[PDB]
Design a protein around this ligand. Structure first.
Ligand SMILES: NS(=O)(=O)c1ccc([N+](=O)[O-])cc1
Ligand SMILES: [Zn+2]
Ligand SMILES: [Zn+2]
Ligand SMILES: [Zn+2]
Ligand SMILES: [Zn+2]
Ligand SMILES: [Zn+2]
Ligand SMILES: [Zn+2]
Length: 263
C-alpha cells in the first residue's frame, strides 16, 4: 500500500527536496559540492527513489553523502545499492551502526521480513557532530528510543532573507518495539522519555521526518503557492507532535506491561 505508492517529488523548502513515496519520506539536500541523500525507502523501492531524484533534474551520481535517521528497513532499504553505485559515504548514529552493518531488526534478528541489505557506516555520529558538504552543514542530535541510534538532523535554510531551522526528526513512535519483558534493546524506555523531552526543548521552525505522517506532508504540499508563506514553516509543531508521541507511549507501555501478566 502507501509505503510503495508514488508521490510526485517537489522542492519543499530552499535546498530540501522531497523524493519519497506516499508513505516513506526521502529527501535530497542540494549543496554547492553535490547532493546529500536523507534516507531511502523499502528495499524494493530503490528504483522509484532514483527515478524521483531524476524527475527533479538531479543526478544520482552526484550523491556524496547518505544520512540515516534510523536503521529500519523502510528507511535503509536502498543504502547498500545507492552507496555502491555512487561511492557515497554513509553517516549514521553510532548505536545504529550494528543494525546497519548486520541488516537486522534489533531484538528480532532472525525475522527475514525486517531484514535489509547490510551496509557499512563510514562515519558514526554522536550528539552535536557536524556533517558538512560544501555550503551545507547538518548537526546530529541523539534522539534514541525508536532505534538505539536514532539521529535527528538539524539544518538552517532560508525563507526569503531569514534563517529557518529544520529538524529531520528521526521518529518517536513505539511501532514494533518491545518496551518491557524482553525489551528491544537495553534502556529503550529511558531513551524514549529523554527524547520526547529533548524534542520539546528544541527551537525548530520546520518539522520533517522519515514518514510524511510525522508532519502532515500531503496537506502542506497542497497549500504551496508562489508568493504565499511556505506551509512547512510551523514552529510549534515539534512540541505538539512530541506531546502526542509521549501520550501514545504511555498507552503502549501500559498495554505491554498488562500483557506480561500471563493468562
Ligand atoms: N519505522 S516504523 O517503526 O514505522 C516500521 C518499520 C517497519 C515496519 N515493518 O516492516 O513492518 C513497521 C514499522
Ligand atoms: Zn510523475
Ligand atoms: Zn522505524
Ligand atoms: Zn519507518
Ligand atoms: Zn541503482
Ligand atoms: Zn541535541
Ligand atoms: Zn507491539
Amino acid at each position: 500500500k502507501k509505503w510503495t505508492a508514488p508521490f510526485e517529488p517537489f522542492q519543499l523548502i530552499d535546498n530540501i527536496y522531497y523524493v519519497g513515496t506516499d508513505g516513506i519520506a526521502v529527501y535530497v539536500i542540494k549543496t554547492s559540492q553535490g547532493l546529500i541523500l536523507m534516507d531511502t525507502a523499502m528495499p524494493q523501492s530503490t528504483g522509484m527513489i532514483k527515478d524521483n531524484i531524476a524527475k527533479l533534474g538531479f543526478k544520482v551520481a552526484d550523491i556524496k553523502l547518505i544520512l540515516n535517521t534510523h536503521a529500519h528497513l523502510d528507511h535503509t532499504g536502498g543504502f547498500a545499492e545507492i552507496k555502491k553505485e555512487t561511492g557515497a559515504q554513509l553517516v549514521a548514529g553510532e548505536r545504529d551502526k550494528p543494525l546497519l552493518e548486520g541488516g537486522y531488526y534489533p531484538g528480532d534478528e532472525k525475522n527475514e521480513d525486517l531484514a535489509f541489505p547490510a551496509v557499512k557506516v563510514d562515519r558514526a555520529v554522536k550528539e552535536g557532530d557536524r556533517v558538512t558538504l560544501g555550503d551545507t552543514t547538518l548537526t546530529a542530535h541523539a534522539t534514541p528510543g525508536h532505534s538505539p541510534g536514532c539521529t535527528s538532523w538539524e539544518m538552517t535554510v532560508k525563507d526569503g532573507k531569514e534563517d529557518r531551522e529544520v529538524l529531520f526528526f528521526c521518529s518517536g513512535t513505539v511501532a514494533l518495539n518491545r518496551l518491557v519483558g524482553q525489551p528491544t534493546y537495553a534502556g529503550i524506555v529511558d531513551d524514549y522519555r529523554a527524547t520526547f523531552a529533548k524534542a520539546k526543548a528544541m527551537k525548530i521552525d520546520v518539522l520533517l521526518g522519515p514518514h510524511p505522517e510525522v508532519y502532515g506532508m500531503q496537506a502542506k504540499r497542497a497549500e504551496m503557492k508562489d508568493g504565499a508563506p511556505n506551509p512547512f514553516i510551523k514552529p510549534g509543531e515539534l512540541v505538539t507532535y512530541a506531546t502526542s508521541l509521549s501520550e501514545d507511549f504511555d498507552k503502549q507501555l501500559a498495554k505491554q506491561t498488562a500483557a506480561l501478566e500471563k493468562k
